Design a protein around this ligand. Structure first.
Ligand SMILES: FC(F)(F)c1cc(-c2nn[nH]n2)cc(C(F)(F)F)c1
Lengths: 106, 105
């Protein structure tokens, strides 16, 4: 396992994480759910990650990738590549979620 | 490259991200409402069917399968799909299967 998929609200809160997060970043799903992904991001990378979330909602379903350091469970910084896109449905004007694929770089 | 698709329990495309164009040659609109098994080489079709039956039993754990996908220009592309069932946090009901689809080459 190299990656896991997460669903976020527009502000960055984890609302679903697949069980591969254990092998990838060391956390059980319940240790991520309800928290903001930005809370696991190295301070120096935090604005970069915030901008990505603002930009991905403008791209309207097109994918945006970003790299940043993620705080693993054993308190080491892991280089992470996240590819993000918005999810919507056509009986709605609202962008409902952001879908992220979170891949451990090395 | 790769794209994410959302499926019902039987394999019907209910969402596909736009990277499907570069990966398999179809617009999302050309896949939606169809079963992924309809794009699968006959020889791989039972293997892909079993995967959908098995992934629902694995309850959130990932299952990978490889199969040949009929691209838009009518060539067989080897695909690696990693699948897991999705349910809302702390909620029991399986709503969808999520697939990450890579053309292996
Ligand atoms: F993050 C995931 F769990 F993997 C996910 C959830 C949903 C969904 N959430 N509520 N309804 N669908 C939709 C997608 C997709 F973008 F692939 F379609 C992915």
């Amino acid at each position: 396992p190299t990656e896991f998929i997460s669903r976020h609200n527009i502000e960055g809160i984890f609302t679903f994480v697949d069980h591969r997060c254990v092998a990838t970043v060391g956390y059980q799903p319940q240790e991520l759910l309800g928290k903001n992904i930005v809370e696991f991001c190295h301070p120096e990378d935090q604005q970069l990650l915030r901008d990505s979330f603002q930009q991905v909602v403008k791209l309207k379903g097109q994918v945006l990738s970003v790299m940043f350091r993620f705080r693993s469970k054993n308190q080491e910084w892991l280089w992470m590549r996240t590819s993000s896109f918005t999810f919507q449905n056509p009986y709605s004007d609202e962008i409902e979620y952001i879908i992220c694929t979170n891949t451990n770089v090395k």
